[PDB]
Write a protein that binds this ligand. Structure first.
Ligand SMILES: Nc1nc2c(ncn2[C@@H]2O[C@H](COP(=O)(O)O)[C@@H](O)[C@H]2O)c(=O)[nH]1
Ligand SMILES: [Mg+2]
Ligand SMILES: [Mg+2]
Ligand SMILES: [Mg+2]
Ligand SMILES: [Mg+2]
Ligand SMILES: [Mg+2]
Ligand SMILES: [Mg+2]
Ligand SMILES: [Mg+2]
Ligand SMILES: [Mg+2]
Ligand SMILES: [Mg+2]
Ligand SMILES: [Mg+2]
Ligand SMILES: [Mg+2]
Ligand SMILES: [Mg+2]
Ligand SMILES: [Mg+2]
Ligand SMILES: [Mg+2]
Ligand SMILES: [Mg+2]
Ligand SMILES: [Mg+2]
Ligand SMILES: [Mg+2]
Ligand SMILES: [Mg+2]
Ligand SMILES: [Mg+2]
Ligand SMILES: [Mg+2]
Ligand SMILES: [Mg+2]
Ligand SMILES: [Mg+2]
Ligand SMILES: [Mg+2]
Ligand SMILES: [Mg+2]
Ligand SMILES: [Mg+2]
Ligand SMILES: [Mg+2]
Ligand SMILES: [Mg+2]
Ligand SMILES: [Mg+2]
Ligand SMILES: [Mg+2]
Ligand SMILES: [Mg+2]
Ligand SMILES: [Mg+2]
Lengths: 100, 95, 110, 52, 19, 354
RNA sequence: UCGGAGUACAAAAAACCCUCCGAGUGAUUUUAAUCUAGACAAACCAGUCAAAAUAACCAUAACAUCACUUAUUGAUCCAAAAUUUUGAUCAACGGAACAAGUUACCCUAGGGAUAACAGCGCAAUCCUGUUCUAGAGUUCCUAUCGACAAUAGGGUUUACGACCU
RNA sequence: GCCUAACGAGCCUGGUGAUAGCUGGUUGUCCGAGAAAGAAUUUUAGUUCAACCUUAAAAAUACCCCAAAAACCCUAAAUUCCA
């Protein structure tokens, strides 16, 4: 089965608190082929709001988006078309969340 | 092609050309279409017509056929009753 | 091997003249495997489904309502099963005729 | 089943011929064709068998 | 044509279900 | 790369969800109708109507008319309802219907039509034949007063001029009988114009017969400005159109400017612009009646040019443009021999130095 | 050799000992003419459409149809026919008119354009470690092991590639 | 196996300047422009056609190109065509 980054593999509900489920779910997560985490609704929305807040905080004027879309420095030559969507956050099958 | 013959030291003509083409004096060569007698029952009326035509050769072929043919075949001929005398000169050609 | 003979050249189906071009009568406007473009005004249909200009003029493309010939079973069935507000649309090619049909000249004054 | 290529001749007395694929196990073929010399639609009957 | 505003104007099959 | 539709897409309205509960036209014909209605609407995408000349499309019409007759809606409605009650009532009529034997008294229908919606039909015929385009240039009028024109072909023979009809110049050799209905405080002007067939001037026309200050229905009593001149198309050109115009005027108008000599066989003297002529007298004259006919050259016309106008007779052809041939090539490739004949000048051998 | 779909996402074109379906014809009668503007396609050969005009027929009467319709095919020469045509699993399908094995008894011309040895690349296979513990260990995960899996390295093996000779 | 130091068929002369799509070689100076492969082929170690290119010569538009325009279920970067 193909799995793209950002997709939920397994969904656990219950009368549980997040912490127990987290404890054993992180094992499974660790034994998956891709890098993966254990998350709750709270944790997920937390990291998404953090993700966008990081990108409206950004001090340097120069973002991958701004440069790629406008083809500055003729940079499109080295980029893939898909990059216009991926915005330097995804490279191959790898996803680095730190990338704004 | 023989460029220098043995006996005469002249340049021979390739007769196989003289049998299937016709040289107008303008330099245009004329030929029959290929397979025009072949398997007629199997072909469209339209296609049959397209085959029955007499057609002209492109430049490359024309130069080739010229090289394969001596000077005699390029002379201006006046034949009595000739169908093709009408077609020997070129008119209104702006080039 | 298992797989064989996938090899055949492209048929060069496509559209030969484009909107706004000038054409002379008999020019092939487009050629196609299935009807993609339908013939419009002053455009003849070939038996291979290709479109050619019947008049000298300018090529125009257009979307229009499609009302199939009642002798054609399939198309009538397709039309008949449509919801009551619906109307089939298709894409057409026309030639807007350029030259006047002919002129009146003075032959002789008797 | 095989078909057959037969030569068909005008009854218009004009020598004129056209060849036709016809079913082998069928009857001797007879048609109404166009004869160019008489410029008419006339009756053609199969004279000969050309190809098999 | 995909690029144009008029794209899919001739689209029908979703109106009639024959399968 | 998707673009965004500009305005509504055609079928976007109906619900795809639950197709089975939607009503369909199982009729081919219903579909055909709906389609022809859809083809008459002003869409936002390139369409046939757009390129093929709806002829100015939307046009605000300057109208120089006679004011439409004022009639009570409700009263008329009542009367008609009644008449149809009476007509439906009879058993005789129903017998006539089931057994497929009935006839309509065409003369009466023609009278009613002349009286009622006739003016509009005559109008759109005039629009079709471009009367309005060549006369008043922008202007449409409804022919409120019916105009009856006829010619005498013999003692017992009468050739009517309806709108758009064909008449032979032989028939038209004499001035026609003219009839319309008005009481007299009235003053009218009648005009006969040849719309095309002016030889020198594409934008101008010929006055044939112009009559003025016409009391009531009395035709001959009016002073004739331009005496009747028989129709004279030219041999080559087909179907010139002649126009009978009828203006209702208030004041008596006198024009020495428009008056022509009594014989007046000069063509430069009859040269006319209906537009200008109307501009002049615009205040008093309001165009009312219209009837016109199509006319092609016939034998009798020859007599005119020689005998009256003291001219030679011009004859025309219809000349089609020469066929288009591509630039000639030095080595036409794969082209039939007869190719060389397309660029041939004339069929005749030419032996240059020989 | 020929065709349809993908590869080749929207004009065209576009490869693989690439992925998949087919063709080497039936059946039928509407037996489907002559001539010619202009074009498509295209190295060439071959392929395709087609107005007007003639002639056929209702007395202003020219698209053979169906099977996914697309493919159902073959040049010159030469043979048979006599008036106008017909003939190739020429399927190595642009086609030599007609010809098989074997050589370690071999020869010559070349090739690192191409194999066997070795190197190099790579790491499927191989070898090391760590990560994760269900389980074995009487009880007890990690004394000794450790399935399902994870991360990273090594460059012994068999291959793979054909880059130096 | 042997047949005058090399015999899967001797040696010598002639045919002979055999024929090699294969390897090697191919001799003054300076200047102008300048090329990576579509098609057939007992063809893929080669040819012959195209496309490019060179040298002359005739011309007139040539690239660049905004709308408008190019399909039917879903479909991107973008193409085509043009003032
Ligand atoms: N089938 C056929 N064979 C031909 C043709 N032209 C020449 N031939 C050859 O002519 C020869 C006739 O003798 P056969 O071998 O048939 O008895 C054969 O070698 C054949 O290949 C042709 O056009 N068709
Ligand atoms: Mg393919
Ligand atoms: Mg190919
Ligand atoms: Mg082309
Ligand atoms: Mg015709
Ligand atoms: Mg071969
Ligand atoms: Mg081959
Ligand atoms: Mg080929
Ligand atoms: Mg040979
Ligand atoms: Mg041994
Ligand atoms: Mg050797
Ligand atoms: Mg190598
Ligand atoms: Mg190589
Ligand atoms: Mg060795
Ligand atoms: Mg080894
Ligand atoms: Mg070694
Ligand atoms: Mg090795
Ligand atoms: Mg080494
Ligand atoms: Mg490694
Ligand atoms: Mg245990
Ligand atoms: Mg992991
Ligand atoms: Mg080593
Ligand atoms: Mg490997
Ligand atoms: Mg390589
Ligand atoms: Mg010896
Ligand atoms: Mg040599
Ligand atoms: Mg070679
Ligand atoms: Mg270079
Ligand atoms: Mg061969
Ligand atoms: Mg070359
Ligand atoms: Mg544009
Ligand atoms: Mg331009």
């Amino acid at each position: 089965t193909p799995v793209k980054a950002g997709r939920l593999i397994v969904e656990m509900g219950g009368r549980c608190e997040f912490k127990e489920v987290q404890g054993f779910l992180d094992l499974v997560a660790h034994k998956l082929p891709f890098p993966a985490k254990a998350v709750s609704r709270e944790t997920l929305e937390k990291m998404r709001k953090d993700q966008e807040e990081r990108e409206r905080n950004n001090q340097n004027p120069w973002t991958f988006e701004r440069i790629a879309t406008a083809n500055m420095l003729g940079i499109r030559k080295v980029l893939s078309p898909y990059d216009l969507t991926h915005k330097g956050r995804y490279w191959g099958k790898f996803y680095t969340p730190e990338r704004v | 092609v023989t460029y220098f013959s043995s006996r005469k030291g002249k340049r021979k003509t390739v007769k196989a050309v003289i049998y299937r083409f016709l040289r107008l004096h303008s330099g245009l060569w004329l030929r029959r279409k290929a397979g025009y007698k072949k398997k007629l029952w199997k072909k469209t009326a339209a296609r049959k017509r397209r085959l029955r035509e007499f057609v002209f050769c492109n430049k490359t072929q024309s130069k080739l056929l010229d090289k394969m043919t001596t000077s005699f075949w390029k002379r201006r001929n006046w034949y009595a009753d000739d169908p093709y005398q009408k077609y020997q000169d070129r008119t209104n050609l702006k080039v | 091997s298992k797989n064989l003979g996938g090899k055949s050249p492209g048929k060069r189906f496509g559209i030969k003249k484009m909107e706004g071009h000038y054409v002379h009568a008999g020019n092939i406007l487009a050629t196609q495997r299935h009807f993609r473009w339908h013939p419009g005004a002053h455009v003849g249909l070939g038996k291979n489904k290709c479109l050619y200009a019947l008049e000298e003029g300018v090529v125009r493309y257009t979307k229009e309502v499609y009302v199939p010939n009642p002798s054609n079973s399939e198309a009538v069935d397709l039309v008949t099963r449509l919801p009551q507000g619906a109307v089939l649309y298709k894409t057409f090619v026309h030639v807007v005729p350029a030259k006047p049909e002919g002129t009146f000249k003075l032959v002789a004054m008797l | 089943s095989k078909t057959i290529l037969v030569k068909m001749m005008s009854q218009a007395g004009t020598g004129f011929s056209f060849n036709t694929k016809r079913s082998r196990l069928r009857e001797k073929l007879t048609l109404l064709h166009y004869d160019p010399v008489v410029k008419k639609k006339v009756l053609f009957v199969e004279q000969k068998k050309i190809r098999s | 044509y995909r690029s144009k505003p008029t794209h899919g104007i001739g689209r029908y099959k979703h109106l009639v279900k024959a399968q | 790369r998707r673009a965004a539709p500009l305005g509504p897409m055609p079928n976007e309205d109906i619900d795809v969800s639950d197709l089975e509960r939607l009503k369909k036209y199982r009729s081919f014909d219903r579909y055909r109708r709906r389609a022809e209605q859809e083809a008459r609407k002003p869409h936002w995408w390139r369409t046939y109507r757009e390129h093929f000349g709806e002829e100015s499309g939307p046009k605000d019409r300057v109208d120089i008319g006679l004011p439409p007759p004022k009639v009570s809606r409700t009263q008329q409605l009542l009367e008609r309802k009644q008449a149809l009650r009476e007509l439906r009532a009879n058993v005789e009529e129903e017998r006539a219907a089931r057994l497929q034997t009935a006839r309509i008294p065409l003369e009466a229908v023609r009278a009613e039509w002349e009286r009622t919606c006739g003016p509009y039909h005559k109008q759109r015929l005039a629009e079709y034949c471009g009367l309005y385009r060549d006369l008043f240039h922008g202007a449409t009028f409804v022919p409120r007063v019916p105009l009856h024109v006829a010619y005498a072909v013999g003692e017992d023979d009468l050739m009517p001029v309806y709108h758009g009809n064909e008449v032979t110049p032989t028939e038209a050799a004499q001035a026609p009988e003219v009839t319309y209905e008005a009481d007299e405080g009235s003053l009218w002007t009648l005009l006969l114009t040849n719309l095309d067939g002016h030889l020198l001037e594409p934008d101008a026309e010929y006055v044939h017969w112009l009559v003025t200050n016409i009391p009531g229905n009395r035709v001959t009593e009016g002073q004739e400005t331009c005496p009747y001149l028989p129709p004279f198309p030219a041999r080559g050109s087909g179907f010139h159109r002649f126009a009978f115009l009828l203006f209702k005027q208030d004041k008596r108008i006198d024009f020495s400017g428009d008056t022509r000599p009594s014989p007046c066989y000069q063509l430069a003297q009859r040269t006319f612009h209906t537009f200008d002529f109307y501009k002049k007298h615009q205040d008093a004259m309001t165009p009312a009646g219209l009837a016109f006919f199509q006319c092609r050259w016939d034998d009798s016309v020859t007599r005119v040019f020689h005998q009256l106008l003291d001219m030679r007779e011009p004859v025309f052809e219809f000349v089609r443009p020469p066929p288009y041939h591509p630039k000639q090539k030095r080595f036409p490739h794969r082209q039939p021999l007869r190719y060389l004949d397309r660029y041939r000048d004339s069929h005749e051998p030419t032996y240059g130095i020989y």
